[PDB]
Nucleic acid binder design. Structure first.
Ligand SMILES: Nc1ncnc2c1ncn2[C@@H]1O[C@H](COP(=O)(O)OP(=O)(O)O)[C@@H](O)[C@H]1O
Ligand SMILES: Nc1ncnc2c1ncn2[C@@H]1O[C@H](COP(=O)(O)OP(=O)(O)O)[C@@H](O)[C@H]1O
Ligand code: ALF
Ligand code: ALF
Ligand SMILES: [K+]
Ligand SMILES: [K+]
Ligand SMILES: [K+]
Ligand SMILES: [Mg+2]
Ligand SMILES: [Mg+2]
Lengths: 442, 413
DNA sequence: TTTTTTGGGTGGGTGGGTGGGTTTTTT
């Protein structure tokens, strides 16, 4: 709404120059995604906008990076033809990639390094340009490395990522050795514009200030905050969001219908994208987990269950006001094991999980909230924070201090920091990100 | 009460000419295999009769291609000496191939292109005639490309076939670049001669007319049709046939005997001929999996069981009305349940009553046509549900073969 | 510990096949 003076000056810095790699970053709520809209309508069809999560893709009026490139939901081994499959000779995506001019990538901080490198390789190989990063496509990335770090399941996946790239962050990709990333910073908060004192407290919390932390507990710790009408609960873990959605569900007058999931092979309960014994009444707030094969709904689309029958569920979407019918999807559990004949790690399906792609959305994980502006939010701390950027994203969703509430006081012992982000954030004050070597692997 | 005149015309054409390769083709039930019996008598039993499936081999009074050349049950790579191995210096098979004059091959539509090519090569190498197709053996092929297509397993021998032949059908074999195939056509149906209206419906279904499909749906749909005694259920998929074989057994009064086998060395659970364990009850239609050295039973005759105690298998056949005893060899008794069967196992048979349980639907070219053409009268055919036009499967290769053979010749360039 | 995405037929053909894979034979 309205480009600010620092927004419009980034707009011209990024549009009227031939340099093909730009990053627009800044604290939460500075208007990065709103500047994306202004860029969306200049390039306006010459640009493909994408984001790593469904929620962030809907906020940016685009698609998930996986959905567009048709990437699988597993480790994308470096330029591996098993994972980065090239599109068909007469495919819609081939023309899409071949005529593409600009690619806008929002919430780039949550983009794991293998995902970014897969995009590079996908664009290079299909566009006939092995010598130019992203095949010659002007890439305009927007995000914040102080917000949620990428999801790296410990074990073989994390070891492959460390050995191949040194770390998981998008800025640790090797493509940045081939092209310098011009950095443009937005400072003035537009989400909390009319509450400057709250915005300043969030700035100090971004710099790990301990006295800002103790002030925050003094002002925003109210355990009853989850009960206030129309406020969303955020939570670090999925199972903590279920236990809290539980009570607002059994406070609705509708008849219960339980959708039961079928699991085959080895698929642990800890890996469930939603609950195997999932109950819903009508009028319940829900979020969708998978994109519609025919594009009537998407991953991260919010809505209200509208009528529910044995295996066919229909929900009124909040995005567009249309009633969509949700038939159950299948999830696969993937395990990576070293193959000694071909001398590489290979992914293996070991179990499956089919269930309706929905979970109640009175309480959500912080990951599904990143990108949104919320009216009010209550953060249920649960068993604690585990991800770099988790606390910050939760606290930055609202416009006003009064709109924020906490489950319990947070201590300085649970602040998390990543040395790689500190190296990145320090270097890009100079204005660009150009790497000479790769990152070391430990 | 003998051969039809067009059966005689085809007989005289393949026997009174100098041409080395012939194809007798026509719609289902036209008497192709009946003509084959005449060819066998004409060549005084010195011809060799092969067929791609055990059902077709038993129907043709011959044996499977694989059994004769001792090919393995995998892809047969082009002229590959580790897939196509010739017999030893004094093998009965070597003497058989060296003295062979005529090879009759029934249900050629189901012969996959690598099978035909392996036959060509096996006969060339063994007979030491490398520049003559089939080693100079006169080949008489009989079959129908609008019946079941050859099976391309869901490994990807499919692309090796695409890379090496461009398709699985027998007429895509490279031997047709060296020899022309003389095509003789039969038109009038003998299996449905008593029901000309039904024969004319099948003719119309053969060419895909949808007004005929609606008439078939309104006439032959009877879900209760598989519960009549004596009728055989055909299914598209193997486990669908086993799933309906078990209820007919479980509902049957009289209580079972369980047969399980012996293991030795290395054997995966479906490397065995029949399934791990087998429960049977006296008075049950089931059919055999292999022949025996003397000659009393044959792989593909079905009936009921008269007595049953653990290792003598007293069961009464239909082929003769005669008697058999089955005892296993390496290791289980080669008998499987036969209330429901795949349509692949039924191609070539003339059946008294047939019910097509469609299950999840048809998936192969010619699958529906075979199931409908087994019986003599329309009243002998029942369907579990009506057929939709979007279930008709057509391979374009078959249309170019069917079109180019209208001048009597098939060859490749 | 959080994200991304779909594979079988006891999920079921009024959900549809340009959402996409699989069935069948041969010792
Ligand atoms: N220039 C602006 N003027 C007024 N409001 C703005 C402006 N830029 C952003 N906003 C508001 O700030 C809120 C969050 O901005 P957003 O674009 O989500 O920032 P970011 O992408 O940096 O988190 C939005 O609700 C938007 O309306
Ligand atoms: N000339 C004929 N006279 C009487 N019956 C015949 C004649 N030819 C074939 N039949 C009968 O028609 C049925 C189908 O014949 P078959 O040889 O199996 O056809 P095809 O192999 O072409 O499908 C069999 O019952 C057969 O006995
Ligand atoms: F930086 Al944001 F919503 F995109 F806080
Ligand atoms: F062609 Al047939 F039975 F051999 F119909
Ligand atoms: K299907
Ligand atoms: K499906
Ligand atoms: K399906
Ligand atoms: Mg944003
Ligand atoms: Mg025949």
């Amino acid at each position: 709404e309205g480009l600010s003076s620092e927004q419009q000056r980034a707009f011209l810095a990024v549009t009227q120059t031939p340099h093909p790699a730009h990053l627009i970053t800044g604290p939460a709520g500075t208007g990065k995604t709103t500047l994306l809209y202004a860029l969306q309508k200049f390039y306006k069809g010459r640009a493909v906008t994408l984001a790593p999560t469904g929620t962030a893709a809907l906020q940016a009026r685009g698609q998930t990076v996986h959905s567009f490139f048709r990437f699988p939901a597993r480790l994308l081994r470096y330029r591996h033809p098993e994972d980065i499959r090239p599109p068909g000779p007469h495919s819609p995506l081939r023309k899409a990639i071949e005529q593409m001019e600009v690619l806008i990538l929002d919430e780039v901080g949550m983009v794991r390094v293998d995902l970014l490198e897969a995009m590079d390789w996908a664009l290079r190989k299909t566009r006939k340009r092995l010598e130019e990063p992203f095949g010659g496509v002007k890439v305009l990335l927007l995000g914040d490395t102080r917000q949620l770090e990428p999801v790296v399941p410990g074990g073989e996946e994390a070891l492959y990522i460390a050995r191949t790239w040194g770390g998981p962050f998008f800025f640790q990709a090797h493509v940045w050795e081939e092209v310098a990333l011009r950095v443009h910073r937005l400072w003035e908060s537009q989400r909390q514009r009319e509450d400057p004192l709250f915005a300043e407290l969030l700035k100090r919390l971004r710099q790990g200030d301990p006295q800002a932390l103790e002030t925050l507990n003094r002002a925003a710790v109210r355990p009853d905050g989850g009960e206030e009408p129309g406020t969303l609960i955020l939570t670090p873990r999925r199972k903590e969001a279920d236990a809290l959605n539980l009570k607002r569900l059994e406070a609705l007058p509708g008849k219960p219908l339980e959708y039961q999931a079928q699991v085959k092979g080895e698929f642990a309960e800890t890996d469930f994208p939603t609950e195997a014994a999932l109950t819903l009444k009508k009028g319940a707030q829900v979020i969708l987990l998978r994109n519609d094969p025919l594009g009537e709904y998407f991953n991260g689309d919010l809505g209200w269950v509208e009528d529910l029958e044995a295996e066919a569920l229909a929900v009124r979407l909040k995005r567009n006001g249309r009633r969509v019918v949700i038939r159950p999807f299948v999830w696969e559990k993937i395990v990576y094991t070293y193959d000694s004949e071909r001398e590489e790690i290979k992914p293996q399906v070991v179990g499956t999980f089919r269930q309706v792609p929905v979970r109640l959305a009175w309480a959500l994980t912080v990951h599904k909230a990143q990108g949104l502006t919320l009216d009010k939010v209550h953060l249920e701390l649960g068993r604690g924070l585990f991800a770099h950027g988790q606390l910050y994203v939760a606290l930055t969703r609202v416009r006003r201090l009064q709109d924020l509430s906490l489950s319990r006081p947070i201590a300085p012992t649970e602040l998390l920091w990543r040395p790689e982000v500190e190296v990145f954030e320090t270097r890009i004050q100079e204005g660009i990100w150009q790497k000479s070597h790769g990152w070391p692997s430990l």
